[PDB]
Subunit: 276 residues, 4 copies
Amino acid sequence: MPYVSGKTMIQQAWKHGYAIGAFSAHNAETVRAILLAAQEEQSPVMIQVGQKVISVMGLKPMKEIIDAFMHDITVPVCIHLDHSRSFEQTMQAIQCGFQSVMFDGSHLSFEENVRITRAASEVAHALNIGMEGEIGKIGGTKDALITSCDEALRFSEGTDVDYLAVSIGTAHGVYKQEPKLAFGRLQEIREIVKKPIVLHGGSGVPDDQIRQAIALGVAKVNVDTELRQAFTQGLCEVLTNDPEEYALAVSLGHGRDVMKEKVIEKIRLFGSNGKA
Amino acid sequence: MPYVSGKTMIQQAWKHGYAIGAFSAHNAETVRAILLAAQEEQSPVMIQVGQKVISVMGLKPMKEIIDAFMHDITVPVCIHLDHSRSFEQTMQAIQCGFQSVMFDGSHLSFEENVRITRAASEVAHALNIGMEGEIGKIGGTKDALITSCDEALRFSEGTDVDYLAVSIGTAHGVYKQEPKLAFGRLQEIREIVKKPIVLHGGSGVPDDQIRQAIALGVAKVNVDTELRQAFTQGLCEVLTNDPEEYALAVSLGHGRDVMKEKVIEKIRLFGSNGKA
Amino acid sequence: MPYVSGKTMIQQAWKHGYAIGAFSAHNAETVRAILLAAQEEQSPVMIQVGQKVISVMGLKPMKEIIDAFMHDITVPVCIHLDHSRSFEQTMQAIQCGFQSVMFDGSHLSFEENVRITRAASEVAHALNIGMEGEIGKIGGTKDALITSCDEALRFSEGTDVDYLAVSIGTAHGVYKQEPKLAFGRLQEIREIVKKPIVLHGGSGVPDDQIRQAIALGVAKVNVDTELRQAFTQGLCEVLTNDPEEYALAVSLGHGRDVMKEKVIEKIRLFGSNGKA
Amino acid sequence: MPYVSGKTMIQQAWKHGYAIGAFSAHNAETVRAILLAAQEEQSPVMIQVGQKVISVMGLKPMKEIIDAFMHDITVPVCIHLDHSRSFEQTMQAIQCGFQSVMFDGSHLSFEENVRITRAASEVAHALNIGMEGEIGKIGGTKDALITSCDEALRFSEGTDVDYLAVSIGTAHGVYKQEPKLAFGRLQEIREIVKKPIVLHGGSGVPDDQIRQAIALGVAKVNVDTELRQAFTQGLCEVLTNDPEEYALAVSLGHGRDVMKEKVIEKIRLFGSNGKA
Ligand SMILES: [Zn+2]
Ligand SMILES: [Zn+2]
Ligand SMILES: [Zn+2]
Ligand SMILES: [Zn+2]
Ligand SMILES: [Zn+2]
Ligand SMILES: [Zn+2]
Ligand SMILES: [Zn+2]
Ligand SMILES: [Zn+2]
């Protein structure tokens, strides 16, 4: 019921200078952890369904699991398809009522990225769905080559995405060496592109930086690994202290609770607590 | 879609001398493990939703998770409420379309057990739902006091349950000492009561015995702990060999696969493989 | 979404001295007419699904049609099964989420009426569903024999229904001769039984009387025929003025609008306008 | 459940030389009439939801009403959006799971018609949905100007529609003067375009012609008015013979039955009877 468009949700966050957390879920406990956190914090949230889980559980199943856990949830929730490299898949998530989608054409040429992102964005706008795209390949944890201020402009204008993902120092996974953001590029994009920014790979970015990025117009911070670290630090404590504990409400329940904490941390860091 | 009444499903198993496995699920992977096994084995199955999971996830959520994973499932599935000690809860599961239910009044006097089991059985029959009850307190892992052949008769006649759970040597949890069934009582009940029997606490019963029990009219064997042992032997192998593995598709995916095996084992032991 | 228990809805009406209209629907337009009226009048309402429509369209279909028209409806709606003479049917409507039900055992002996009404009421209370029963056969349009004040008491106490239907001068269909209510019996029942009353066959009762009955504790007034008169006075005006008008949005659309008026009339007469 | 893609359904009809009837529904009875006919005739069918009903009942409601009446239906059904002049509306029907859609750009220039039809067709193909478009304005009941064989080719190639609607002598409504088809154009299109054809305004086309058109590659015949004529010839017989008949199961029930006949007529004429 309290499913809110992602255009609406990112825009509000932007206008009022907070970022919304995009928390990747992989199963039931994780979905619930996320929804519990947000509710306890009176915070709007995005649940992210990404390519990894999609291959395990499936698109449609995972939407339905999220739907199942929304009964006592009064705060704004938006379901987001992450890193879709397929128009069909983008079209599928729309069809089962995702409230936001991201078509990632970063591995395609400028022309082709733009052509498909636009096609998917036209559909999303038609049905009131937040639309994300990416310009600039974001890696996964050796000179340097970031995203142009101009590339961004043209991409944004050509695709009419609601929120733009740029490559700006983040990467996917447990960071080897503390990275550093191009706060400068962010400044320029803020002024040129006049659109909210998405930071991929915010797991492992120092808090200082995150809040600095949110100040330069970042309104969506994706969180995946940090949450799985926490969930796994839970499974472990229990499982390596007592391996003969067979109650999944404890072993994975403690995985959940610890991950619930991690979300609340991030909600606060992003400053959305209070904002429902 | 392929949800089949539990009256129908246990009766067929009984008539044709196999037992259906009642596999307790606690989350998504577990639900899927069960459904994968059954499908690979062309076997009808029961998914059990019991009081423990209900307190974690909820009745309605867990039914909806099962529904979500039924898209590619062609074999007969029945959803079973386990060990309900409440009429309201029994009525709730009916309302969201469980295909079987068990009201456990074993902790109530004969009169009160019968009165409520009957009330719930009247509702279940009305909407074509398999109905289970229990006479005789089944423990959880010191002289002896089993279920009377006559108690059984009166209980069965008074309640009109479809399948009867009797206390006959089983118990809930990791068995301390290899138990032994009253195959004799089973013989008498088979002849007197003329109704299928449910064996609670079949996790840890030697195979020989299980097949012997299925021969004396057991048509439903409940499996919970053994499945969680397996799922936890999975989480562990991965997690204690590599604690920095943060991919839940691996750590809990291997929990799933190992548990998928355990189900298939039991399906075969119970002899339902082939029977869709 | 805005589906409200009928125990809650009739009780509020009772406490605050208004009656809720129970409007029988037979198809889409009729369902919508009812929902449109109520919404325009900020009034809680009951949609009644009765034995006639059930035989045409079915229980489950008609609930789903009502569900389909609830998208823009913000006021309290309750779906009511009317004149069910079957436990199975009563149990079916519960299972697909009716918010009120009536088991009519008026054609059964006191003992049997009470036994089944009680059984159904136990289920309804369990799942928070308004429960209605009837004592005294209400006819369908020649000395006299109404409902006892004492019969009512015992019936009410034995069944624990939320709202009681008594035979008090009403009848089903286009009234041959202006009838007259036993306002006296109503007075006694009000004081003895301490429970809301349902008036069957309020189509064709003079307004004066209706408001008088609502004053003596009637909180539910059933409306069926008057609504079908109106809907048919619509189909006719159009169809007999222009028989070659083939647009169902006009011929049956005007059936709808005229019936929308009739509802609003009744909402006002019953005094629920404003009460959401 | 037995909802079948319209690409699949029209193609089979084409390959095997029958046409599928596209029957416009406006309410419950009409939906049911259609589904009853088809089922009695073991025939695949298309239910059409068009702009008129959409303004009365709404897209999403009408899909849900059709869903509600599909419980006992074993034959192939496809839900078709008719004469959509909006991308948003086309995208909406996809989102609630129509199995076929028609974007009508006949009132747009060649370039713009093609551009939007293509955009919608790309989405439809992505989610396995039959796609229809129109080249050549089809009127609604004075020299002559039909559809070019070449216009058709280019349109078809540019849009990749599954089935093409051409202007070929039909028109919407009660035909003033018996029209005549360009069977010749049909011949040419059959050979050039290699795609199934849709005949709009088949209500009032002599049977001879219909079967002749089906022979030249027409695989979809739209029926609306004839069905409403019949439904209204029903309402009338009853209503003008007895105006004081207030039972909607009779007055509109007889509207239904008569319309059920009309469908069966057409199913046979189109030759789909038997083909499930
Ligand atoms: Zn990313
Ligand atoms: Zn990325
Ligand atoms: Zn047990
Ligand atoms: Zn037990
Ligand atoms: Zn009545
Ligand atoms: Zn009555
Ligand atoms: Zn047309
Ligand atoms: Zn047309």
